[PDB]
Ligand binder design. Structure first.
Ligand SMILES: COc1cc(S(=O)(=O)O)c2ccc3c(S(=O)(=O)O)cc(S(=O)(=O)O)c4ccc1c2c43
Lengths: 211, 215
């Protein structure tokens, strides 16, 4: 088959900044199509026949290229354009898509608002004890979290989940859930959430004691 | 011009499934129908294409004996049948209208999420997340754990028009999904005004409400 490679895989850009993303073909083709996709929705035909813009797409967008080199360009980035973009070829059977270029929007950095939550007495009476830690509103996405019990580190038994770039403030968030049973939580008292982000060298720390 | 696909499906491994794609607003027989697979939100894989007028098919060699494309000209409906299903086949499948040479896929259905697993449908267990520090705002949450399959819908109802809400994608633990949702409201509103998280799990036909309480 014929392979398509898009670059960059992921990128950021500020409002008004010009953006360009490439689509390379393993062998010479004659045209490609570009599809925009936002989270939880279907792909939309964005650009087709290399240069033709679909109905209702802003004039900011454009496309060019030939042979094996193709590109999509945005003259002035806006928050509306934060999405993933796939290129598409059908010069030979079967057609193929690129891995995609996830286009995120750039903003000023921000420290995560941290909050810890102990296991609810409801969950306790069900034979479980999950302690939650919300790391809300931070930029960029890269972050690390670690749980400590009375000062002692605990790895695994932990799950983390990152949200996509928030559409209102362009920030990110992550949840960290240390899941135990009941008596496993009944041994020790102090439970501490420690978060490390690019913004500061000192970690953001929230904690509680059982009593 | 719009395409509607059948709803989500939970199926046992080895069984089969049949997805529908109801076209409307255009001459169904004049435009080919392509099918695309999107696994866990990453890349797109082209399955096959069918000519609704003549009924001739063209499959991707990777999907010869995995997908079967058919069409009903009477009800202007395209069909894709998947057989011998495994966990690898669990994904979102789209039907896209072939707009013609040098036009690409100019219309896409909303997609259908298929889940191939042995786990049974289970309703969620919801747990409140309330603080046991004093600051400017207050963040609350609800933990959704032990449900299957995806998805769930958490909707918060507070006495405040500002609602910094965050929905955290579900992660699979112990063969059951787990989700968390957070909300940030002004301190002067809670607990002076009721805050509730409404977790809806249509697969099990269960809606659970949790009123957040101080500690
Ligand atoms: C070898 O290239 C082939 C072959 C077929 S086939 O399925 O009839 O072999 C195609 C069948 C259908 C094509 C269709 S459509 O009819 O589904 O809109 C579009 C395109 S294009 O990339 O938008 O030109 C194509 C571009 C190239 C195509 C084919 C299409």
């Amino acid at each position: 088959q014929l392979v398509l490679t898009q670059s960059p895989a992921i990128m950021s850009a500020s409002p008004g900044e010009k953006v360009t993303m490439t689509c390379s073909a393993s062998s010479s083709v004659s045209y490609v199509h570009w599809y925009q996709q936002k989270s939880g929705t279907s792909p939309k035909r964005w650009i087709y026949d290399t240069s033709k813009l679909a109905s209702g797409v802003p004039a900011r967008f454009s496309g060019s290229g030939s042979g094996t080199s193709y590109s999509l360009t945005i003259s002035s980035m806006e928050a509306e354009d934060a999405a993933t973009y796939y290129c598409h070829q059908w010069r030979t059977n079967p057609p193929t898509f690129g891995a995609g270029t996830k286009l995120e929007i750039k903003r000023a950095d921000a420290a995560p608002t941290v909050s810890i939550f102990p296991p609810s007495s409801e969950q306790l009476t069900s034979g479980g004890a999950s302690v939650v830690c919300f790391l809300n509103n931070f930029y960029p996405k890269d972050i690390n979290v670690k749980w400590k019990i009375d000062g002692s580190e605990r790895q695994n038994g932990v799950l983390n989940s990152w949200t996509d770039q928030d559409s209102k403030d362009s920030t990110y968030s992550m949840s960290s859930t240390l899941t135990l049973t009941k008596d496993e939580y009944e041994r020790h008292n102090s439970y501490t959430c420690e978060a490390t982000h690019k913004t500061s060298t000192s970690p953001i720390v929230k904690s509680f004691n059982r009593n | 011009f719009q395409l509607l696909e059948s709803g989500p499906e939970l199926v046992k491994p080895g069984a089969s499934v049949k997805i529908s794609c109801k076209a409307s607003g255009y001459s169904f027989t004049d435009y080919n129908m392509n099918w695309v697979k999107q696994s866990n939100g990453k890349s797109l894989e082209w399955i096959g294409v069918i000519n609704p007028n003549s009924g001739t098919t063209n499959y991707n060699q990777k999907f010869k004996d995995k997908a079967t494309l058919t069409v009903d000209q009477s009800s202007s409906t395209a069909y894709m049948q998947l057989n011998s299903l495994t966990s690898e086949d669990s994904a979102v499948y789209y039907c896209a209208r072939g707009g013609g040479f040098r036009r690409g896929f100019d219309s896409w259905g909303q997609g259908t999420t298929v889940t191939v697993s042995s786990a049974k449908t289970t309703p969620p267990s919801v747990y409140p997340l309330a603080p046991v520090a004093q600051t400017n705002s207050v963040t609350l949450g609800c933990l959704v754990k032990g449900y299957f399959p995806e998805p769930v819908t958490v909707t918060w109802n507070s006495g405040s028009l500002s609602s910094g809400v965050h929905t955290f994608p579900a992660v699979l633990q112990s063969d059951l999904y787990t989700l968390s949702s957070s909300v940030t409201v002004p301190s002067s509103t809670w607990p002076s005004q009721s805050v509730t998280c409404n977790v809806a799990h249509p697969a099990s036909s269960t809606a659970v409400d949790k009123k957040i309480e101080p500690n």
